[PDB]
Amino acid sequence: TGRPEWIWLALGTALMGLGTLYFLVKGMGVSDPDAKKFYAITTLVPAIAFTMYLSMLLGYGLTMVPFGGEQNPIYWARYADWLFTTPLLLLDLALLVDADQGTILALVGADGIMIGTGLVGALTKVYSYRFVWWAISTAAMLYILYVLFFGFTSKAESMRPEVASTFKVLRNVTVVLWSAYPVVWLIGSEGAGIVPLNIETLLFMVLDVSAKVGFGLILLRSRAIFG
Numbered sequence: 001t002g003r004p005e006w007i008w009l010a011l012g013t014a015l016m017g018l019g020t021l022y023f024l025v026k027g028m029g030v031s032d033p034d035a036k037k038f039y040a041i042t043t044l045v046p047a048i049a050f051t052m053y054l055s056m057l058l059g060y061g062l063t064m065v066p067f068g069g070e071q072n073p074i075y076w077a078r079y080a081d082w083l084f085t086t087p088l089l090l091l092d093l094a095l096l097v098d099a100d101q102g103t104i105l106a107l108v109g110a111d112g113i114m115i116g117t118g119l120v121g122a123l124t125k126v127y128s129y130r131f132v133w134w135a136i137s138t139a140a141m142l143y144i145l146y147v148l149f150f151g152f153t154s155k156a157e158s159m160r161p162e163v164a165s166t167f168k169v170l171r172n173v174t175v176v177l178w179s180a181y182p183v184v185w186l187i188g189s190e191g192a193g194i195v196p197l198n199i200e201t202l203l204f205m206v207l208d209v210s211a212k213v214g215f216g217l218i219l220l221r222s223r224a225i226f227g
């Protein structure tokens, strides 16, 4: 097939794999129980991304959805990735500030809605309705970000500065990166079709790699993960 976006898919696969192995190696050397917890969650995130980037590189996770008078190329494997990686990242943040079970449940649930309506919108055949689903998915994301910014930051204040400071950074990287996904979707192949797929794939790999390996490097190198 040789689609123009394959090189970014190859690069995404490469970065996710390397990040996975490094976290795995670093994770199985640590003896602290809590640190092990964080390591297991954070290593699994890029591990899942790697498998999906690899599948997409190999030609899977792609479907032609008709709308706008065109046969549009929609990479659905992405939602198969995000369905599990986004809540895991959320869990990392939750464990960090000792969030409550109710909070976590509500965040993971909002997250499920976000990815769920996102895919439904990415698969919808009525052009205008694709944006209705997109709109709902974004509303869910803003709920999650609101909670992370207003709820979590507040509870991270019961933690040590080292832990509060690590959370701030992770929270910040998350707010900035996550905020970017809906915009990429809106102007890319799933939406307005302004930004071509090859470029769109490039933007997504940069956000995904930054949001997973970037996020993991920051979290796993901190002393805040220790019991």
Ligand SMILES: *C/C=C(C)/C=C/C=C(C)/C=C/C1=C(C)CCCC1(C)C
Pocket (backbone or CB within 6 Å): 082, 085, 086, 089, 114, 115, 118, 119, 134, 137, 138, 139, 141, 177, 178, 179, 181, 182, 185, 208, 211, 212
């Ligand atoms: C490793 C992957 C990460 C951190 C992915 C984050 C993905 C999002 C914040 C995705 C958000 C979306 C919307 C707000 C609406 C349209 C569809 C999505 C799923 C692209």
